[PDB]
Ligand binder design. Structure first.
Ligand code: Q4A
Ligand code: Q4A
Ligand code: SAH
Ligand code: SAH
Ligand code: ZN
Ligand code: ZN
Ligand code: ZN
Ligand code: ZN
Ligand code: ZN
Ligand code: ZN
Ligand code: ZN
Ligand code: ZN
Lengths: 261, 260
């Protein structure tokens, strides 16, 4: 017997509502945080917004040709006609995706635009048995489909070293030393409730849209396979997360190939 | 009336914005880049600190007297249809503060209009005496948000070095700081709106995602009923005419014209 603890945690900010349900305990809909559907900042981030620094395409079509600068920047356009990733997409070692932007001569409905169109999957925040809150899909999601962005507060590396709660962090590591993270503890979208899984049905991909400042990629989760309606969403948190949390608790992921229990 | 474009915005607006010409044989303008939202070339350190935003904690649709966001703008001037109340002072607009992502209310509350985008069927057309112009293709009730003046966000000293100043809009309040929106190289439909001494459009300074006073956004609202086919217009102000006045005189044709 699952009780509806919220009609939509996003409060209309997403294209579709994201309900919350409980059928495990008496815990109420989470509220010790603020829902934001887009990345925000506290301390000012020097993101390069210079519109003339943007690289862009001058296509006269729907950006399906190999001449599209944006596709070239992404090595090639990885989206098919339905906005899904092509099969020859390296899920184990994702390339950076550069979607068309407002500087491109193309139309707002060209092919190289997917993450920028927001959430299009009916998800649901629900209470699990062991991991607490989790997220699941109320519909079938085909492989290579864009599901959700990992949205939170943009903070510096050092800023990350002075925060008690660090279970809601995503590193945007760069061999440039210039390292940043997205902390969804205080500010975050539905992704902050996604749990870890060793054989994840979601893989994070670095995407670039309105700007192309490589220090600040936005994280878009794509389905690594067919996800069945009712299935819980999951993604690999990575070695740093477990390398520090692996000293506090074991991985309740329950995967036959699990790598952190 | 030849159709030179099905949509100059290329799909970036909620509705398309066609472009026609039944005068000369000039093609759809293209010596500029259309942008549905403000942009910057040189950096502008807009205060985007989310903890700096003021907001409301309303448990309703922000249509009560306790919405803090409404109080900031003295009161919420929007009605259930998103139109400005009859008591709104067109000749002396107040600063409007729409609800933002920091508020506790829902994304569909009453205090959100300009952040919702273009919803009036407009059209860029070729006029006979003022070059290009924007007209309405539908009746537009008074107090209706029509469009925003979007362009390049530049400083005072920067606009001061730009020879071409026909597409500049001043955002002032001296204190060592004063900014403009240059729509010459980057702008939306509003760049094609011609001047009029008895305008059916009035600029209103609005704040939404951020509340950095140096950067209000310019929202145009109808000052009266605008019927289908009528050309849009707003007062360019004194600085514009004090300058461009030395070259040509106004041609709005208003019996009460103040610059011809
Ligand atoms: C990927 O998931 C995680 C990413 C995390 N990233 C960081 N960063 C800050 C320091 C490393 N920097 C190079 C990368 C960003 N810190 C993290 N945690 C910090 C939190 C503050 N603590 C303070 C501290 C230091 C030493 C001993 C005890 C406590 C240091 C580790 C994370 C934790 C994560 O999983 C929990
Ligand atoms: C509202 O419409 C206008 C606003 C304009 N604003 C400005 N500003 C810059 C100086 C005054 N400052 C306080 C307000 C913003 N300059 C303006 N024009 C300046 C541009 C630079 N020129 C000098 C120039 C000439 C040739 C080449 C380079 C520069 C002097 C007039 C405008 C003009 C406008 O109508 C045309
Ligand atoms: N595979 C896994 N096994 C055990 N706990 C997990 C897990 N994946 C995520 N978690 C738990 O959830 C935190 C990640 S944040 C996800 C939200 C969380 N389940 C909640 O109810 O708020 C971790 O610190 C951990 O406590
Ligand atoms: N009432 C008016 N009388 C004469 N010229 C006007 C005018 N309103 C606008 N303009 C003309 O347009 C410029 C403002 S920008 C508006 C766009 C312009 N009509 C175009 O076709 O690109 C002015 O410098 C002037 O040349
Ligand atoms: Zn292209
Ligand atoms: Zn492009
Ligand atoms: Zn494109
Ligand atoms: Zn596991
Ligand atoms: Zn309110
Ligand atoms: Zn509010
Ligand atoms: Zn509100
Ligand atoms: Zn006049």
């Amino acid at each position: 017997v699952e009780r509806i603890v919220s009609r939509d945690i996003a409060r209309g900010y997403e294209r579709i509502p994201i309900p919350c349900v409980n059928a495990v305990d008496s815990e109420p809909c989470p509220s010790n945080y603020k829902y934001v559907s887009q990345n925000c900042v506290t301390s000012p981030m020097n993101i390069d917004r210079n519109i003339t620094h943007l690289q862009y395409c001058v296509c006269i079509d729907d950006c399906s040709s190999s001449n599209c600068m944006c596709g070239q920047l992404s090595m090639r356009c990885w989206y098919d006609k339905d906005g899904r990733l092509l099969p020859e997409f390296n899920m184990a070692e994702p390339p950076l995706i550069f979607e068309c932007n407002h500087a491109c001569s193309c139309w707002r409905n060209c092919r190289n635009r997917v993450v920028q169109n927001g959430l299009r999957a009916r998800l649901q925040l629900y209470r699990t048995r062991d991991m607490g809150w989790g997220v699941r899909s109320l519909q079938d999601i085909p492989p290579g489909t864009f599901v959700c962005e990992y949205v939170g507060e943009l903070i510096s590396d050092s800023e990350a070293d002075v925060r008690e709660e660090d279970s809601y962090l995503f590193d945007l590591d760069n061999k440039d030393g210039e390292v940043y993270c997205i902390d969804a503890r205080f500010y975050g979208n539905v992704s902050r409730f996604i749990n870890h899984h060793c054989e994840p049905n979601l893989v994070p991909v670095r995407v670039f849209m309105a700007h192309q400042d490589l220090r600040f990629p936005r994280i878009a989760f794509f389905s690594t396979r067919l996800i069945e309606a009712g299935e819980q969403l999951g993604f690999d948190y990575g070695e740093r997360f477990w390398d520090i949390k692996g000293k506090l608790f074991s991985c309740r992921c329950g995967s036959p190939k699990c790598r952190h229990s």
